[PDB]
């Protein structure tokens, strides 16, 4: 089974350089091209360029010729993309894909900012034959925050909303779940919040007040 494993999310300063990786497994890396694609938040797909890992040959979109450098290491079956002179316009998800686009990496989020990392505060949205309850994940930077319920055992009826950027420059998000009213006294509901950039892990129990 083929996999293209991309490096984790990056929070990088403006004017610096970032180098993202795409590690291939499940096939002969040097026998297929690797293409790189940019996706700005809420926008479409833009093609950056392509490398042949067997020869080292590359082709770039003119729009990325100055900014991007594609490399590949045969010994580690890894393709790399370095972006230089970073600006807020470079904040996006970058994907690697095997030539033709059947197999894709999972994407690497790149956030270009001089702002400091900040972990969130988690507050309950306490429930008042269906009840709604949730968690408010406030004042964090950068994205993303992930939320699960009951360590992943509770998925039906969950809605984790897109984060919003507040005037402060900090993000906030809410996650809600609807459950049977009859369960409020017998079932513990916990929202598990993870903000990897700040190593924040909060498991907030949400009780009827």
């Amino acid at each position: 089974q083929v996999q293209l494993q991309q490096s984790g999310a990056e929070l990088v300063r403006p004017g610096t350089s970032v180098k993202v990786s795409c590690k291939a497994s499940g096939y002969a890396f040097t026998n297929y091209l690797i293409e790189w694609i940019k996706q700005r938040p809420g926008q479409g797909l833009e093609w950056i360029g392509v490398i042949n890992p067997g020869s080292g040959g590359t082709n770039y979109n003119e729009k990325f010729r100055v900014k991007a450098t594609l490399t590949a290491d045969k010994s580690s079956s890894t393709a790399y993309m370095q972006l230089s002179s970073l600006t807020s316009d470079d904040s996006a998800v970058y994907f690697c894909a095997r030539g033709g686009g059947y197999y894709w990496g999972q994407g690497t989020l790149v956030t270009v900012s001089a702002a400091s990392t900040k972990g969130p505060s988690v507050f309950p949205l306490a429930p008042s034959g269906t009840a709604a309850l949730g968690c408010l994940v406030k004042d964090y930077f950068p994205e993303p925050v992930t939320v699960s319920w009951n360590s992943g055992a509770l998925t039906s009826g969950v809605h984790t909303f897109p984060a919003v950027l507040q005037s402060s420059g900090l993000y906030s998000l809410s996650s809600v779940v609807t459950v049977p009213s009859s369960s409020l006294g017998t079932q513990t509901y916990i929202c598990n919040v993870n903000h990897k950039p700040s190593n924040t892990k909060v498991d907030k129990k949400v009780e009827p007040k």
Partner: protein, 218 residues
Amino acid sequence: DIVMTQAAPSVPVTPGESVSISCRSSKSLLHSNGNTYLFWFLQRPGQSPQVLIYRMSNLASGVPDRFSGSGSGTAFTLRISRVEAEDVGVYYCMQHLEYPYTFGSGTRLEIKRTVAAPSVFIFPPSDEQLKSGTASVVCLLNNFYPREAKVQWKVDNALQSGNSQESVTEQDSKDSTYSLSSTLTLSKADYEKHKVYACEVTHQGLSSPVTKSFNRGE
């Protein structure tokens, strides 16, 4: 470069019906080897794109037979028969004939389900948050359709302006609804100067606005 155009930013489709999504190119995608290098991709929210059609009219490995592609060399159509609730997402065309490769702007597939009014819930700020000096009042609009919904906040029955922020989910892949959250943010000092907090919701599925409210301190 070759410009790829998708004329429709979205197309609504009732489940079970068929839908066509169009793409056009500014140059023929036909190669002298006889193939036309037009590809169709689907991208679901939070996921990588996935190939559907390769070389304009061939179904990619593992893609359901309800997907088909055709075209002229400069105008192309992705056809989806028996559209399911799970088909929600964005469909992009791409030319793979000449560098730089280019993508169309995408067409979102919107599932047209029965109109459903939101189930509205209001949450006061928690005591934990109030200790920290801020108050977030949350209004939840759950599992509604269509997407358009207006939320108005009223504090002591007075319409608010400039102090709320809304977030909407992507269309649910099973029930085809949306959910929306609105947060009204005040300092703890200003929150404690008022008694009544309400969110008023306007939506196609409601004959008149629905209000949910609470009195501070219960």
